[PDB]
Amino acid sequence: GPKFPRVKNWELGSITYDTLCAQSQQDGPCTPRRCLGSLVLPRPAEQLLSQARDFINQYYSSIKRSGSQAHEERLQEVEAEVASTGTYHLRESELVFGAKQAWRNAPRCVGRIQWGKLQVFDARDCSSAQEMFTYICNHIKYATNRGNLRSAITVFPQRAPGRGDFRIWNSQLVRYAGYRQQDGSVRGDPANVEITELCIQHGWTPGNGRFDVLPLLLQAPDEAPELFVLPPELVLEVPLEHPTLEWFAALGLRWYALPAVSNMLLEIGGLEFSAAPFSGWYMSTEIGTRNLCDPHRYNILEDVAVCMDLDTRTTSSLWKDKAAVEINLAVLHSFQLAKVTIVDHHAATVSFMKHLDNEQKARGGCPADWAWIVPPISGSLTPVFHQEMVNYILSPAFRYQPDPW
Amino acid sequence: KFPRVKNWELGSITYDTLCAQSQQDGPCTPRRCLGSLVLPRPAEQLLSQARDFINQYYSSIKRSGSQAHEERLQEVEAEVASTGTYHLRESELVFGAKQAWRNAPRCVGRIQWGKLQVFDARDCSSAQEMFTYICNHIKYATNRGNLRSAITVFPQRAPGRGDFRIWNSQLVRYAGYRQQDGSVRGDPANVEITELCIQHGWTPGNGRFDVLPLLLQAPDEAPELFVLPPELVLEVPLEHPTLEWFAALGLRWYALPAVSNMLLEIGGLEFSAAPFSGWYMSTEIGTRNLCDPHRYNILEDVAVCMDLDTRTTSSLWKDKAAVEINLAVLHSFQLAKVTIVDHHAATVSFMKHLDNEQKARGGCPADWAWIVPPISGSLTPVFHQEMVNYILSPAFRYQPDPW
Numbered sequence: 001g002p003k004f005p006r007v008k009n010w011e012l013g014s015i016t017y018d019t020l021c022a023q024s025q026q027d028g029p030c031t032p033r034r035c036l037g038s039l040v041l042p043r044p045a046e047q048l049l050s051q052a053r054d055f056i057n058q059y060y061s062s063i064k065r066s067g068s069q070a071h072e073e074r075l076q077e078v079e080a081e082v083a084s085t086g087t088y089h090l091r092e093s094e095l096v097f098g099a100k101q102a103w104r105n106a107p108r109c110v111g112r113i114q115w116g117k118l119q120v121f122d123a124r125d126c127s128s129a130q131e132m133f134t135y136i137c138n139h140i141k142y143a144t145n146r147g148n149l150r151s152a153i154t155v156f157p158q159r160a161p162g163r164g165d166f167r168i169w170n171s172q173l174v175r176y177a178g179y180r181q182q183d184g185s186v187r188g189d190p191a192n193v194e195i196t197e198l199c200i201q202h203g204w205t206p207g208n209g210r211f212d213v214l215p216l217l218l219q220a221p222d223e224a225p226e227l228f229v230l231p232p233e234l235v236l237e238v239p240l241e242h243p244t245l246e247w248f249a250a251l252g253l254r255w256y257a258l259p260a261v262s263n264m265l266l267e268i269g270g271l272e273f274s275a276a277p278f279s280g281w282y283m284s285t286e287i288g289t290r291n292l293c294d295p296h297r298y299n300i301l302e303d304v305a306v307c308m309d310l311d312t313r314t315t316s317s318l319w320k321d322k323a324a325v326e327i328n329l330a331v332l333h334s335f336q337l338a339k340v341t342i343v344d345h346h347a348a349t350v351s352f353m354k355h356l357d358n359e360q361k362a363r364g365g366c367p368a369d370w371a372w373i374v375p376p377i378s379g380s381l382t383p384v385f386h387q388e389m390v391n392y393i394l395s396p397a398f399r400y401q402p403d404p405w
Numbered sequence: 406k407f408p409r410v411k412n413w414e415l416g417s418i419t420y421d422t423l424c425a426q427s428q429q430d431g432p433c434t435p436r437r438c439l440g441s442l443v444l445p446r447p448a449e450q451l452l453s454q455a456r457d458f459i460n461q462y463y464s465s466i467k468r469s470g471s472q473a474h475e476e477r478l479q480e481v482e483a484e485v486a487s488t489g490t491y492h493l494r495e496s497e498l499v500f501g502a503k504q505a506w507r508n509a510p511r512c513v514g515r516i517q518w519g520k521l522q523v524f525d526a527r528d529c530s531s532a533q534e535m536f537t538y539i540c541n542h543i544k545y546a547t548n549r550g551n552l553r554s555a556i557t558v559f560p561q562r563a564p565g566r567g568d569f570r571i572w573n574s575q576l577v578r579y580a581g582y583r584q585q586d587g588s589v590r591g592d593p594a595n596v597e598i599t600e601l602c603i604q605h606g607w608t609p610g611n612g613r614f615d616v617l618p619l620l621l622q623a624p625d626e627a628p629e630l631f632v633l634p635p636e637l638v639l640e641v642p643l644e645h646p647t648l649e650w651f652a653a654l655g656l657r658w659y660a661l662p663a664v665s666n667m668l669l670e671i672g673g674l675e676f677s678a679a680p681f682s683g684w685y686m687s688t689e690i691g692t693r694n695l696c697d698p699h700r701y702n703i704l705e706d707v708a709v710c711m712d713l714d715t716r717t718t719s720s721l722w723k724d725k726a727a728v729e730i731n732l733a734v735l736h737s738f739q740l741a742k743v744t745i746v747d748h749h750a751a752t753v754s755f756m757k758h759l760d761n762e763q764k765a766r767g768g769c770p771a772d773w774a775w776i777v778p779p780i781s782g783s784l785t786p787v788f789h790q791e792m793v794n795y796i797l798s799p800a801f802r803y804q805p806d807p808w
């Protein structure tokens with residue numbers, strides 16, 4: 001019957017039609033001849049005006065005022081401003097709506113049940129690297145909130161014609177050092193090799209531990225970046241122990257409480273906020289499966305299996321699956337004990353199914369990237385595994401952007 | 406512009422150029438991706454597919470462009486022009502079946518693709534004859550537990566008449582008996598086929614693991630019922646290497662996975678009954694068949710036996726039971742000496758396959774959501790590997806249920 005993607009849940013037998021994808025203005029990487037959905041990197045003038053008009057229409061709808069005089073004056077305001085300046089500026093309440101809408105729009109986030117609850121710090125008055133540092137520290141203090149984490153975003157000035165960008169160089173506000181060795185290996189987190197070497201080229205005195213917190217490299221328009229060390233008491237970490245395996249604590253493993261992405265671009269109504277770091281809380285599989293067990297990350301699967309006395313010489317003992325489970329349980333248990341917000345992959349995905357049902361009623365669909373939504377252990381044990389998903393790009397949005405160097 | 410395909414664990418990059426040869430559209434468009442969807446959203450026609458397939462064949466035997474080739478193309482041409490259809494030589498059929506398996510994007514076992522026993526059953530005129538061919542196939546493929554991949558191919562679709570079909574979705578399937586209180590005894594995926602069997606006269610049982618009969622159908626005839634002789638259906642009792650109470654759950658599974666409702670398309674010709682088999686990957690039995698909520702759904706029972714905290718997701722009880730159940734399956738198949746492959750060995754060998762395919766053909770169509778196992782995804786190398794999905798022919802396809 002309906003001319004929109006049919007979407008099926010194979011566990012419960014239920015069908016829906018996504019009508020929201022109609023609202024996609026921006027193409028993704030797929031064509032009728034080939035599906036490129038599994039690729040991680042999906043490879044103005046009047047152009048700005050129409051993005052702006054579209055965003056202002058979205059704002060007036062969210063407050064139920066489409067067609068009103070407040071609505072048509074705001075449009076006229078926006079084009080007048082572009083008319084003479086080439087760009088325009090967002091009201092405070094517009095920025096707050098657009099930031100939540102960007103989270104809500106993100107196909108790869110499983111945490112969107114929470115989308116309506118986001119503290120938006122407005123930092124569009126910021127004019128130096130020192131000041132960014134102050135805002136960032138404020139963000140971390142508020143978001144961390146002694147372990148009872150609160151979702152938050154801090155928005156720095158938008159991109160502007162000619163003038164250089166605001167940029168945080170690090171990919172997260174909290175990142176462990178990755179030190180390349182003589183023996184070709186790496187101490188710390190291999191993911192952070194490059195940002196580590198940049199920090200050093202820029203005058204940071206490197207440690208040599210597995211869990212050295214990096215300084216921040218902050219860049220204000222048309223200036224070399226500057227280096228700022230986070231005060232250690234601001235950076236809450238959790239030491240990792242296991243509820244029954246007494247030796248697990250002796251491994252000296254740890255992770256930080258606050259995940260906070262700092263290198264993504266927040267785009268709203270054509271405006272481009274190149275520095276707009278955002279934070280929530282972790283799903284446990286991010287730490288316990290990916291960060292600790294990826295072969296190219298900490299890679300601790302073998303060491304843990306040896307302690308558990310598993311047969312690591314044969315795949316069919318499932319030593320990998322057993323070790324990974326215990327690591328995940330340790331992460332959950334240690335966060336619980338420390339009273340630091342965290343969510344397991346079962347709670348997370350159940351809440352995402354609720355989110356999908358909310359959005360079906362509210363917008364008639366929800367863009368979602370199945371390969372990312374499904375957890376990296378125990379996939380089919382979660383209800384998202386059995387749920388078809390339609391992936392597409394809406395604006396406002398979080399986007400990847402080239403690295404500044 | 407061709408796709409860049411990156412592996413994120415090793416940082417290596419390929420380009421897929423094989424996809425340029427795709428002639429069929431997939432479910433996606435520029436505006437939206439539909440890859441996680443499970444089901445799909447004249448003479449010159451047949452003639453191009455035929456020419457193209459005959460060209461694939463002669464190329465493969467390196468006898469391309471020449472005499473045997475040009476004459477084979479004329480034969481196909483002469484036959485289509487007069488009859489609106491043609492027929493394949495046995496050795497072409499053999500090439501086509503292997504190539505259809507090779508091209509299947511959802512298949513993690515393709516390293517094996519060159520090793521396929523092909524039974525030509527195109528001289529089949531009755532359900533009875535289909536039954537005999539189906540038994541030889543089971544007997545050959547099972548091989549007392551040393552499983553061997555096989556396909557049996559029945560007579561192709563013809564404009565004039567209905568299809569040869571096997572109603573059952575696999576050759577071995579456990580009964581599912583719906584209760585008046587909604588609930589199911591046996592395998593809830595097989596409720597509708599169980600019911601069809603009874604309607605066509607089968608005496609039901611009441612076990613959790615009662616093996617179904619086959620419903621075989623010769624063209625335009627009511628389907629016919631046939632019982633598989635119990636000694637043809639090899640089964641493995643499930644026990645656990647260290648948990649003695651596990652055996653007592655009375656769980657088992659059959660050795661031979663043989664798909665029997667898909668359509669085999671070669672050279673524009675369609676083979677509506679062409680059952681195929683190989684061997685199981687352990688996660689198919691251990692994770693999906695026994696732990697899916699809408700399958701036998703044994704996760705809670707196992708967790709209670711292991712004495713775990715059921716009250717909370719965050720004890721990871723589900724993850725712990727799943728792992729033991731998969732362990733039980735591998736141990737049990739190893740003990741009965743029946744071919745099985747675990748998901749680590751399987752995905753490791755699929756990686757080697759992508760690499761062979763890259764050198765040979767310049768790409769490999771693969772469906773990431775189906776290749777990555779349903780437990781321990783990121784623990785296998787495939788998780789970390791970008792994959793391009795597209796339809797090449799020869800191919801296995803879905804087709805509608807005959808009832």
Ligand code: HEM
Pocket residue numbers: 103106108109110111112114118151152153278279280281282283286343348372398
């Ligand atoms: C409330 C707690 C939250 C949880 C548990 C959560 C969970 C996640 C997870 C697990 C991922 C995938 C991570 C990975 O594999 O690298 C993700 C992606 C993402 N989330 Fe969240 N999220 C939360 C809140 C937030 C917030 C506050 C924002 C921004 C306002 C956000 C925006 C994103 C974006 C943009 C991505 C995808 C990044 C990319 O495409 O590469 N989420 N989320």
Ligand code: HEM
Pocket residue numbers: 506509511512513514515517521554555556681682683684685686689746751775801
């Ligand atoms: C030799 C051992 C083999 C193994 C271990 C294997 C493994 C698998 C697995 C795990 C799947 C996913 C099935 C599911 O989740 O339901 C699959 C899909 C498939 N395999 Fe295999 N395979 C093997 C051999 C074969 C053979 C011999 C054929 C046919 C000649 C074949 C054709 C297929 C096809 C067509 C699919 C796709 C099914 C669909 O689209 O629904 N495979 N394979």
Ligand SMILES: N=C(Nc1cccc(O[C@H]2CN[C@H](COc3ccc(/N=C(/N)c4cccs4)cc3)C2)c1)c1cccs1
Pocket residue numbers: 111169170171172191192195259260261263278279280281282283286400401403
């Ligand atoms: N490689 C780099 N740049 C770069 C360029 C393009 C993309 C990119 O990756 C994104 C996707 N993946 C990465 C992280 O995204 C995440 C990470 C964690 C995450 N998890 C959470 N629970 C939350 C974070 C924030 C709110 S919830 C949610 C999203 C960030 C990194 C650099 C490394 C060092 C300096 S530049």
Ligand SMILES: N=C(Nc1cccc(O[C@H]2CN[C@H](COc3ccc(/N=C(/N)c4cccs4)cc3)C2)c1)c1cccs1
Pocket residue numbers: 444514662663664681682683684685686689803804806
């Ligand atoms: N049944 C429905 N939808 C439907 C229709 C066609 C196909 C389908 O799913 C596929 C996926 N999967 C199924 C069989 O595929 C398999 C199964 C097992 C398998 N495993 C193996 N190891 C092998 C089998 C043979 C050689 S290796 C490899 C492939 C078949 C579902 C309907 C619901 C309501 C009205 S109609």
Ligand SMILES: C[C@H](O)[C@H](O)[C@H]1CNc2nc(N)[nH]c(=O)c2N1
Pocket residue numbers: 038039040371372373413788789790791792
């Ligand atoms: C190749 C593949 O796209 C890549 O490994 C993806 C798979 N799914 C993922 N899912 C999440 N949430 N995060 C990731 O980094 C990835 N990696």
Ligand SMILES: C[C@H](O)[C@H](O)[C@H]1CNc2nc(N)[nH]c(=O)c2N1
Pocket residue numbers: 010385386387388389440441442443774775776
């Ligand atoms: C919606 C989703 O695509 C569906 O559940 C798929 C996911 N991946 C799968 N992968 C395999 N091998 N088998 C399956 O049945 C499925 N189910």
Ligand SMILES: [Zn+2]
Pocket residue numbers: 030034035036037433437438439440
């Ligand atoms: Zn796609």
